[PDB]
RNA sequence: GAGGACUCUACCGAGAGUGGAUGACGUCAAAUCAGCACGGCCCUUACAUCCGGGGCGACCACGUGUUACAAUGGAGGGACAAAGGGCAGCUACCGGGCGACCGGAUGCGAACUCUAAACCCUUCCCCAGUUCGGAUCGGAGUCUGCAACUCGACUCCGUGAAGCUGGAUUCGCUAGUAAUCGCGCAUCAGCCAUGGCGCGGUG
RNA sequence: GCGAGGAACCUCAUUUGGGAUAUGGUGAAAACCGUAGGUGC
């Protein structure tokens, strides 16, 4: 029916339903070419498909939270682990390029007595 | 400025004294000068003294404390 | 030119109308809308009828120069006399 | 601090509660030549939020009615229910 | 017809033991005050006050510190 | 990190050097505009090869590359002009021609 | 009806960590009688007490910041998609309005109501103290409040200042970090909030 | 950019002046008239 996976990056959660088809990636009931108008953002989301697989899958994506770079990176991670479920022989091809590893870095909390996290007031 | 729905802020006791009216002493520094005040000597408090003010038509529409500096 | 002031010809109208003492950007836009002139073409590309309409909108309803300076100086003098 | 501070605060609260009805009746209408006949103490604009026990007029907290120093003291002592200290 | 019971306290173990359940998100408040009683700023500590809420439903029909709303 | 149009990490590193204020797509657009201007005005090889040759014309190899990129960007800022890309294209053409205040400085 | 959220549990490299709080170990006769108690001394026809009107806001040096001095930019018109935190107060919707919010009404004491901007397109400005900058000053007002002169905030219309990237020196950090962009809260009738405390985007 | 994480009145401690120690009229108000405490050392 639909191979399912999830991706997270900063405060952005992506859900992928990969089914057999011919391209036509739809995100949030909107086309991928109209939801992400930047060619860099479309290259990140559709990166692992071109690494191995494009034009042979129909993908529906639900996005929530974060910004445009957070969501595009979160969407890339979700697709990467959805492709390894379809074939267990594609794991080394995706890990070598560094696609299945989740980056856990999130915005650090602001410590008291300082205007920012690691920035201190000017002493002089 | 004071909203037009409320009208001018004129002290009722000072207005009554002026209408019934010698220099008239007062502490009403925030009272707005009305056209009925014209021709009168009002001694406004300033903190330690009573500065006299002779009301003329040009001053109409200004607070009484504008013509009595404190510092 | 228009009224006692020779505007920069190369500038567009909605900014070249700000060179008069009594008109800012918002007043320039309002006057252009009231007179029906576009805010894209330059001052040099004005017909005589367009310039007459702009001049008539400026006059009889706006304080621009001379009169505005006299009024401001009178207000300053009245405040000083206060 | 002091005692006259608390005494006049209580007097202001009593006068405000006494005159809370006529002031609202005059304010709902357009009357203002009579709204200035009320005593200045009767208006609720002269109601500062002092600490309930010490009486400090700064650093007030609305939830507990106490200043920040008293709040820290009682939070360390366990007197305030629920409030704990963050492990981080 | 149904009856919904909403429990809320400041102790997760207390509400869990009281409720003999959908766990609602908690409401955490953070208070920041100066450690010193005088001008020494930039030295603060954080006090956390948490509120835990739970919901249960009975279709077609307690320790201190828990408030329960029945609807 | 891969470049979005060329796929070379050197382009991404150069855009990182160019980056101001945390805005990276602006630096990418400036670099691509300068690479287009280097072909529109003057211009043998492609724009990417010309830029690589200019970098070579302008110690660890990574440190050498970093200092070359920093020098090129600094002198691009130093030279006059209106648009930053319109400026920087002159540095690429001038480092290809091996002249100017940028070379050997 | 269980892919996420939300809130309870159990293992987490012998193979192919970070941030914060704890601070037994400390010297400064270091600070705090104005948070709070308290030894001694001094005030009681006044250093006690009530109220109006003023002051803490008046005018060279130092510290801490906010805006800029511009094209990696300003303006106009369209397209974007966040985390946390407030709601007797915020407010769905209709019109008086240029606008600050007023006047009729609607949900909501809280997984109904206030939350984006930087970015992505299109056009103008083309190196000009300017379509940069927004100080100061004149007019109109909208609120709060008994009262806005000394001495509040906000909105319109004018006015348009210094300012062309900063000498000796000096300050802050080593990654979702600096630099930037917006959002929220505490106290509070209103507010001087460009401060303090947090939250997220790109990086 | 601190105690202060809200100085127009109040806060307010500081200054000048007026008081005290049901209705009317007089008053800027406090107040008037007839019918233990210290935000002192
Ligand atoms: K108050």
UniProtKB/Swiss-Prot annotation, chain A:
SUPFAM superfamilies linked: Ribosomal protein S5 domain 2-like
Keyword Ribosomal protein: yes
GO biological process terms, semicolon-separated: translation
Highest taxon in the source lineage: Bacteria
Alphabetical list of Pfam families matching this protein: Ribosomal_S9 (PF00380)
HAMAP family: Ribosomal_uS9_B
Location of the region described as Disordered in the Swiss-Prot/TrEMBL record: 104-124
Composition bias type Basic residues, residue spans: 111-124
Annotated source species: Porphyromonas gingivalis (strain ATCC 33277 / DSM 20709 / CIP 103683 / JCM 12257 / NCTC 11834 / 2561)
Protein name as it appears in the record: Small ribosomal subunit protein uS9
Entry similarity comment: Belongs to the universal ribosomal protein uS9 family.
GO CC entries: cytosolic small ribosomal subunit
Gene Ontology molecular-function annotations: RNA binding; structural constituent of ribosome
Alphabetic keyword roster: Ribonucleoprotein, Ribosomal protein
Gene3D superfamilies: 3.30.230.10
UniProt keyword annotation of Ribonucleoprotein present: yes
Gene name of this polypeptide: rpsI
PANTHER family hit by this protein: RIBOSOMAL PROTEIN S9, SMALL RIBOSOMAL SUBUNIT PROTEIN US9M
InterPro entries: Ribosomal_Su5_D2-typ_SF, Ribosomal_uS9, Ribosomal_uS9_bac/plastid, Ribosomal_uS9_CS, Ribsml_uS5_D2-typ_fold_subgr
Alphabetized NCBIfam families for the sequence: PRK00132.1 (NF001099)
From Swiss-Prot, chain B:
Pfam families: Ribosomal_S19
Gene3D superfamilies per UniProt: 30s Ribosomal Protein S19, Chain A (3.30.860.10)
GO biological process, one term: ribosomal small subunit assembly
Keywords: Ribonucleoprotein, Ribosomal protein, RNA-binding, rRNA-binding
SUPFAM superfamilies assigned: Ribosomal protein S19
GO cellular component terms, A-Z: cytoplasm; small ribosomal subunit
GO molecular function per UniProt: rRNA binding; structural constituent of ribosome
Keyword RNA-binding assigned: yes
Role according to the record: Protein S19 forms a complex with S13 that binds strongly to the 16S ribosomal RNA.
Family: Belongs to the universal ribosomal protein uS19 family.
Descriptive protein name: Small ribosomal subunit protein uS19
Lineage: Bacteria, Pseudomonadati, Bacteroidota, Bacteroidia, Bacteroidales
Gene: rpsS
Curated annotation (Swiss-Prot), chain C:
Keyword line: Ribonucleoprotein, Ribosomal protein, RNA-binding, rRNA-binding, tRNA-binding
Listed GO MF terms: rRNA binding; structural constituent of ribosome; tRNA binding
Coiled-coil regions, chain positions: none
GO CC, alphabetical: cytosol; small ribosomal subunit
BP GO annotations: translation
Superkingdom of the source species: Bacteria
Recorded family membership: Belongs to the universal ribosomal protein uS13 family.
Function, in words: Located at the top of the head of the 30S subunit, it contacts several helices of the 16S rRNA. In the 70S ribosome it contacts the 23S rRNA (bridge B1a) and protein L5 of the 50S subunit (bridge B1b), connecting the 2 subunits; these bridges are implicated in subunit movement. Contacts the tRNAs in the A and P-sites.
Subunit structure: Part of the 30S ribosomal subunit. Forms a loose heterodimer with protein S19. Forms two bridges to the 50S subunit in the 70S ribosome.
This protein's name: Small ribosomal subunit protein uS13
Curated annotation (Swiss-Prot), chain E:
GO BP annotation list: translation
Keyword Ribonucleoprotein tagged: yes
Any one GO molecular function term: tRNA binding
NCBIfam families per UniProt: PRK00596.1, rpsJ_bact
Lineage of producing organism: Bacteria, Pseudomonadati, Bacteroidota, Bacteroidia, Bacteroidales
Keywords attached to this entry: Ribonucleoprotein, Ribosomal protein
GO cellular component, one term: ribonucleoprotein complex
Organism: Porphyromonas gingivalis (strain ATCC 33277 / DSM 20709 / CIP 103683 / JCM 12257 / NCTC 11834 / 2561)
Family: Belongs to the universal ribosomal protein uS10 family.
Pfam family, one: Ribosomal_S10
Functional summary from the UniProt entry: Involved in the binding of tRNA to the ribosomes.
Protein known as: Small ribosomal subunit protein uS10
PROSITE patterns for the chain: RIBOSOMAL_S10 (PS00361)
Subunit structure: Part of the 30S ribosomal subunit.
